[PDB]
Structure formats: structure tokens, C-alpha cells
């Protein structure tokens, strides 16, 4: 069962967007209930995964934090599996890993710009999905590297599609979000309509969401490239995209993915995750 009124009480957040148009939660600290969730998601075995790529240098100063730190504060008390898509591997951190925590790597094709490695992530990732992982895990994230878990970032995130709010234009307006403009782009939206403006550093659901997800992504993407256009904002205006035309079911606030450079206003109260410096 479980109703959207088990677990969250938007009632305790200062008046800060905790509902959607189309009836959906935007999680903030404070109207989550991490308790009866834990539970609730225990009693039935839900694992849930994690894509993380890591191409040059990135793997070399990032990937570890953010292994570390996800070992420590993602879904803790709960079966993680963190698939690692490397251009190396010779190089790849082995950090210690904790309970209910176990991994698998991949050594996949680097090519240096985005054209490439944000195009070939949205196809690797679905072809990940449909070979393994809708067979491995209830829930899949897919994230960047360079950020850091700074605290208990649980199954109150959970969702059939989850989205996340770019720190930065959360505040702002439609008419002010970096969408793609240009009409000749697949990743084109208009000046009227736009719900929010989602950050591409994290973006989950069921494997069968994120599949098509990714799909659509990458499709478009690909389309742009036979266009000579590059979307600007590259894979992130792509999703966002699809997300103004497949409303997530689940929004997290910029807590779940804050950037420290824009300070700290009363409007954060916790930080679960943030950017990387």
C-alpha cells in the first residue's frame, strides 16, 4: 500500500513548493519520515543501484569521495549496488566497502568532449539497464562523480521517476531556466511552458523509467548531432525535456544536491549531497 500521507507532511516545511500540478512531492528536510519508509521498504527486499562514470582525470580525484561518501550516507540499511562505468580500471580506487554494499565495474570507451561522454552515458546506461540491472535492483540512480554524500541521503528519494532541482534556478522562474531555445534541437522547449529546471547530476526511478529515460536522451541527442546543434547544457536539456513531458513522480529539493558556492540559505536546512570542488 503506502499513501503519499504515510511518510510525507509538507506542513513542516516553510513554505517551499512540496507539491506539483500534477499531485507529485518535492522532498525537503523535515517531511520525509525515514523511519516508517525504512520498514516498509525493508519488508520487501528493495536494492537499489547506482551508475557512476568516471573518464580521465575525474576517476583520479572524485571518484573516491564519492564512493566513499555514498558507502556512508546512500540508502544506508539497504542493499546497495554501485555499478562503476571506468575508462581505466588500472586506475580505479578500490575503497572498502561496508554492509549491504557490493559493486561491479566496467571498462567502458572514453572519446573526451560530451558529443561523447554525456551522449554514449545515456546509451551505456540503458544498455546496462536492459542487460543487468532491471534484473539486479528494485530502484537505479545515475549520478556524476564529482559530488560528495554529506548526509543520510535514504529511501525517501525513492520513486518510479525521481528528478532533481538544479540548486541554482529553484527560486527562479520558467522564462529564466537555461532550457534550449533554439527550435531546431530535440531538447527544445518554448517560452510559455516549463515546470522546473532539473539538474542532470541526479536523476533515478525503476530501471524501466530511467531505460526510457536515458532512451530518449540519447535518441534526441543523437537527432541534435545529425543537425549539426549541440544543445547547450548537452545532456542536461535533453532531460529536462523529457521531464516537461514526462513529469517525474518525485522531485528532490536542492538539499539532495547543493552547491556550497551559493552559501547556505535558511531555505537548506540539511544537506544530503553536494558539489564537488
Known sequence: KLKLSDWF???????????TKWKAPVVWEGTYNRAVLDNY???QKITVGLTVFAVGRYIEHYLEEFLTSANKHFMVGHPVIFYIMVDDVSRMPLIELGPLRSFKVFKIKPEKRWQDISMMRMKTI?????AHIQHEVDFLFCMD????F???????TLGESVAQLQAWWYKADPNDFTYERRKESAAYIP??????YYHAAI???TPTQVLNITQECFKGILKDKKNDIEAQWHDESHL????????????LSPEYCWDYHIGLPADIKLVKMSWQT
Open 9 to 19: 507532511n509538507p506542513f513542516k516545511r516553510p513554505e517551499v513548493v512540496t507539491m
Open 41 to 43: 521498504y525493508a519488508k
Open 126 to 130: 540503458g544498455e546496462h539497464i536492459v
Open 145 to 148: 562523480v564529482d559530488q560528495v
Open 150 to 156: 554529506q548526509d543520510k541521503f535514504g529511501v525517501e
Open 191 to 196: 517560452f510559455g511552458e516549463g515546470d522546473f
Open 203 to 205: 536523476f533515478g526511478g
Open 240 to 251: 529536462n525535456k523529457y521531464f516537461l513531458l514526462n513529469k517525474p513522480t518525485k522531485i
